[PDB]
Design a binder for this molecule. Structure first.
Ligand SMILES: O=C(Nc1ccc2n[nH]c(-c3ccncc3)c2c1)[C@@H]1CCN(CC(=O)N2CCN(c3ccc(-c4ncccn4)cc3)CC2)C1
Length: 347
C-alpha cells in the first residue's frame, strides 16, 4: 500500500497517488485519485476499535452521513475495511474532495459581506435539513465547514451528533462537555446537556461573528472562562432569563456577579452590515428558549436574496435510532460498524 507521512494508507488499488491534507484525533485525511470514477477524492483513515468512545463517534459519523443526502452536507462515497470483523483494524471513509475549510480560509482572507451572506445561507440551509431529521450536529465550527473555489459549502463531522431530546436536556451547573469550547452556548455551563436544536444555532452565531472579524468572538481559555467571555459581551442576564435557569447553583452564580453592560454589536463589528448584526444578535441570544430557530434565521432580512423554502429541503423522516450508544461495549459497536459498512464490499 502507499504510505503517507510514515503511516500505512491501505486503500489500493481503487485509490492511488495519495497526498496529505491534515490530521487530528480522528486519524488522518489525504486526497487520492479514484480509478473507477476518474477524479480526486478525500480519504480519511480511522482506527477506533480499542476504545468505546472512538467506536461511538465512528458509528455516529457513518450512520448519519449514509442517511443524509443534501448539497450542504458532506456525503460518504465509499468505505474500505477488511472482509471480516476479526481482520478489521482500520476503516477508510471516502468523501468528496473540497479545496479548504473555513478555519483555514479565515487565517488568510478577510471575507466580503456577500461571501459571508452566501456562506451563512448555506450553513443554515444544511442545518435546516439536519434539524428536520431531529439530529443535532453539536460541533459546528469553521474547521467543520468545507469550501471549494465555486464557494460551495458543506458541513462535516457528525462524531458528536445526537438525536434531539428536549425532555432530557437538563443537567447541573459546570457539567463537563466534549464539544469545542469556543462555540459552546452559555447554557452548556449552566444547565444544559446540548440536546436541543438551540445548541447549534449558538455555534452558527459564533461562526458568523468569526467571519465578520477573522477572530473567534468568545475565545475562552478554560471551561468557566468561556461563560466569562459570553457574559462580558452579552452583559448580565435579565431577571426573566435568570428565573428560567433551573439550577440553584447556576442562579446563585449569576446573582453573585457584578452588573455588566452589554457590548453593542456595532462596536465589536463597526464595518458589518446592520442586517447581519441583527441576525447575529438573535442567534447569540442568552436564553435558548428565545434564540432564533433555523427556519426563522433563513427567513431573516439578511438572507432575503437567497431565501426560498421550496429550495431548502428537509429529510424524509426523523431519525429514531440510538446515537448515545452509551451502554454498548466497544465489541458490540465494532459489530455495528461492520454491519453499517457492508454495502460497500465487493460482493
Ligand atoms: O470529514 C472530515 N473532513 C473532511 C472530509 C472531506 C473533505 N474533503 N475535502 C476536505 C478538505 C479539508 C481541508 N482542506 C482541504 C480539503 C475534507 C475534509 C473531518 C475529519 C474527521 N471527520 C469525522 C470522522 O471521521 N468521525 C468522527 C470522529 N471519529 C473519531 C474521533 C476520535 C477518535 C480518536 N482516535 C484515536 C485517538 C483519539 N481519538 C476516533 C474516532 C471518527 C469518525 C470530520
Amino acid at each position: 500500500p502507499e504510505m503517507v507521512r510514515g503511516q500505512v494508507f491501505d486503500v489500493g488499488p481503487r485509490y492511488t497517488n495519495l497526498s496529505y491534507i491534515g490530521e487530528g484525533a480522528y486519524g488522518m485525511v489525504c486526497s487520492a485519485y479514484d480509478n473507477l470514477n476518474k477524479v480526486r477524492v478525500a480519504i480519511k483513515k480511522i482506527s477506533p476499535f480499542e476504545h468505546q468512545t472512538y467506536c461511538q463517534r465512528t458509528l455516529r459519523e457513518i450512520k448519519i452521513l449514509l442517511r443524509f443526502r443534501h448539497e450542504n452536507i458532506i456525503g460518504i462515497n465509499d468505505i474500505i475495511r477488511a472482509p471480516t470483523i476479526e481482520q478489521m483494524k482500520d476503516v477508510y471513509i471516502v468523501q468528496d474532495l473540497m479545496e479548504t475549510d473555513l478555519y483555514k480560509l479565515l487565517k488568510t482572507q478577510h471575507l466580503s459581506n456577500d461571501h459571508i451572506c452566501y456562506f451563512l445561507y448555506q450553513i443554515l440551509r444544511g442545518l435546516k435539513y439536519i434539524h428536520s431529521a431531529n439530529v443535532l450536529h453539536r460541533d459546528l465550527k469553521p474547521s467543520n465547514l468545507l469550501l471549494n473555489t465555486t464557494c460551495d459549502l458543506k458541513i462535516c463531522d457528525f462524531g458528536l451528533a445526537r438525536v434531539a431530546d428536549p425532555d432530557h436536556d437538563h443537567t447541573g451547573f459546570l457539567t463537563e462537555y466534549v464539544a469545542t469550547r469556543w462555540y459552546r452556548a452559555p447554557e452548556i455551563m449552566l444547565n444544559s446537556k446540548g440536546y436541543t436544536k438551540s445548541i447549534d444555532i449558538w455555534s452558527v452565531g459564533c461562526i458568523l461573528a468569526e467571519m465578520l472579524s477573522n477572530r473567534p468572538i468568545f475565545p475562552g481559555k478554560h471551561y468557566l472562562d468561556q461563560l466569562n467571555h459570553i457574559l462580558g459581551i452579552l452583559g448580565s442576564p435579565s431577571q426573566e432569563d435568570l428565573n428560567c435557569i433551573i439550577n440553584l447553583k447556576a442562579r446563585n452564580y449569576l446573582l453573585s456577579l457584578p452588573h455588566k453592560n452589554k457590548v453593542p454589536w456595532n462596536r465589536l463589528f463597526p464595518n458589518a452590515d446592520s442586517k447581519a448584526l441583527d441576525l447575529l444578535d438573535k442567534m447569540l441570544t442568552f436564553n435558548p428558549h428565545k434564540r432564533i430557530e433555523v427556519e426563522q434565521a433563513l427567513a431573516h432580512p439578511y438572507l432575503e436574496q437567497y431565501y426560498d423554502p421550496s429550495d431548502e429541503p428537509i429529510a424524509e423522516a426523523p431519525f429514531k435510532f440510538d446515537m448515545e450508544l452509551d451502554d454498548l461495549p466497544k465489541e458490540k459497536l465494532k459489530e455495528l460498524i461492520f454491519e453499517e459498512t457492508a454495502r460497500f464490499q465487493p460482493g
